[PDB]
Write an enzyme that holds these catalytic residues in place. Structure first.
Site, PDB file in Angstrom:
ATOM      1  N   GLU A  17       1.531  11.401 -11.208  1.00  0.00           N
ATOM      2  CA  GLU A  17       1.760  11.293 -12.665  1.00  0.00           C
ATOM      3  C   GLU A  17       0.772  10.333 -13.215  1.00  0.00           C
ATOM      4  O   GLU A  17       0.459   9.382 -12.492  1.00  0.00           O
ATOM      5  CB  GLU A  17       3.152  10.715 -12.882  1.00  0.00           C
ATOM      6  CG  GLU A  17       3.555  10.458 -14.311  1.00  0.00           C
ATOM      7  CD  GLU A  17       4.954   9.845 -14.513  1.00  0.00           C
ATOM      8  OE1 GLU A  17       5.763   9.785 -13.597  1.00  0.00           O
ATOM      9  OE2 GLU A  17       5.265   9.446 -15.658  1.00  0.00           O
ATOM     10  N   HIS A  20       7.960  10.946  -6.569  1.00  0.00           N
ATOM     11  CA  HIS A  20       6.626  10.983  -7.078  1.00  0.00           C
ATOM     12  C   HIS A  20       5.973   9.603  -7.278  1.00  0.00           C
ATOM     13  O   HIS A  20       6.657   8.581  -7.236  1.00  0.00           O
ATOM     14  CB  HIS A  20       6.572  11.844  -8.338  1.00  0.00           C
ATOM     15  CG  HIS A  20       7.278  11.268  -9.520  1.00  0.00           C
ATOM     16  ND1 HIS A  20       8.640  11.422  -9.740  1.00  0.00           N
ATOM     17  CD2 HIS A  20       6.798  10.582 -10.578  1.00  0.00           C
ATOM     18  CE1 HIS A  20       8.956  10.832 -10.883  1.00  0.00           C
ATOM     19  NE2 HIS A  20       7.861  10.285 -11.387  1.00  0.00           N
ATOM     20  N   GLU A  28      -9.166   2.344  -3.076  1.00  0.00           N
ATOM     21  CA  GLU A  28      -8.620   1.335  -3.967  1.00  0.00           C
ATOM     22  C   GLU A  28      -8.777   1.734  -5.418  1.00  0.00           C
ATOM     23  O   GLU A  28      -9.807   2.274  -5.819  1.00  0.00           O
ATOM     24  CB  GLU A  28      -9.308  -0.025  -3.733  1.00  0.00           C
ATOM     25  CG  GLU A  28      -8.653  -1.174  -4.482  1.00  0.00           C
ATOM     26  CD  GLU A  28      -9.105  -2.564  -3.987  1.00  0.00           C
ATOM     27  OE1 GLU A  28     -10.334  -2.782  -3.796  1.00  0.00           O
ATOM     28  OE2 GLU A  28      -8.212  -3.396  -3.741  1.00  0.00           O
ATOM     29  N   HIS A  42       0.830  -1.209   0.000  1.00  0.00           N
ATOM     30  CA  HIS A  42       0.000   0.000   0.000  1.00  0.00           C
ATOM     31  C   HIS A  42       0.869   1.266   0.000  1.00  0.00           C
ATOM     32  O   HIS A  42       2.113   1.251   0.302  1.00  0.00           O
ATOM     33  CB  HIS A  42      -0.991   0.042   1.165  1.00  0.00           C
ATOM     34  CG  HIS A  42      -0.364   0.003   2.516  1.00  0.00           C
ATOM     35  ND1 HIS A  42      -0.119  -1.174   3.174  1.00  0.00           N
ATOM     36  CD2 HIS A  42      -0.007   0.990   3.376  1.00  0.00           C
ATOM     37  CE1 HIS A  42       0.363  -0.921   4.377  1.00  0.00           C
ATOM     38  NE2 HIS A  42       0.467   0.382   4.520  1.00  0.00           N
TER      39      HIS A  42
END
Ligand SMILES: [Mn+2]
Ligand SMILES: [Mn+2]
Ligand SMILES: [Tl+]
Ligand SMILES: [Tl+]
Ligand SMILES: [Tl+]
Ligand SMILES: [Tl+]
Ligand SMILES: [Tl+]
Ligand SMILES: [Tl+]
Lengths: 134, 134
Positions: free
Chosen positions: A110, A64, A41, A7
């Protein structure tokens, strides 16, 4: 022995704001919410927003988090976020389409078309200064 | 429109050092290296290291990156990193074994047993303050 990413956890000053951005603007599913955080999620990605109130955002560096998108959806995603006033932090110069945007705290995100294997392939042709493969 | 996590990029001050940490200590496979970075792979996780010589590590907040590990491998992993002198930044108090350690620049990492499903299962039977699922 590690199996992969389990996670991603981001510090957020304004929890409601961050839930709204990730769920409503980016399309994550809100699986749970509590006074101090949220769990979302996206595909197999488990995201957790951890409320932290005096949080001032990240320092200014290259760290990032990139999310995938299909070639066919890129332009419309980029157009949608720009129309919503999202702020950008980088202009694309590397293989595959990429849109580089900030979240409510200034975490660098991104949306990228491509994967490791496509980046490596393009690199084998046009090496960054001093590239070694293995 | 987004599909999942495409890649994780971390700023690193000492590229040789971070490569050695992720590859040898954490078991990532090194796919490529250049004068300003590296690409490593672990399961489906594409990890990118971006060299920034003056980078001084993140500020102190809860932002962190967790990797999956099987319950039977947990004790050994923790034991091994502790022996290698790795510094810890948090002690586990939530569902599933977790070891919380720092990388060479101070990025916060975690090795975790369990996943979102297993976590949601535990939360229901014992909710955080004001928790709600949906
Ligand atoms: Mn990137
Ligand atoms: Mn965690
Ligand atoms: Tl996956
Ligand atoms: Tl978590
Ligand atoms: Tl790119
Ligand atoms: Tl990348
Ligand atoms: Tl960079
Ligand atoms: Tl835990």
């Amino acid at each position: 022995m590690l199996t992969g990413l389990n996670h991603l956890t981001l510090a957020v000053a304004d929890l409601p704001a961050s839930i709204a951005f990730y769920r409503d603007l980016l399309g994550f599913r809100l699986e749970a919410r509590w006074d101090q955080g949220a769990y979302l999620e996206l595909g197999s990605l488990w995201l957790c927003l951890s409320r932290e109130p005096q949080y001032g955002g990240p320092a200014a560096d290259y760290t990032h988090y990139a999310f995938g998108i299909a070639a066919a959806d890129f332009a419309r995603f980029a157009a949608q976020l720009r129309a919503h006033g999202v702020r950008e932090w980088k202009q694309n110069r590397s293989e595959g389409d990429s849109f580089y945007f900030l979240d409510p705290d200034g975490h660098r995100l991104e949306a990228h078309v491509g994967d490791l294997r496509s980046r490596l392939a393009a690199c084998r042709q046009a090496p960054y200064a001093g590239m070694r493969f293995a």
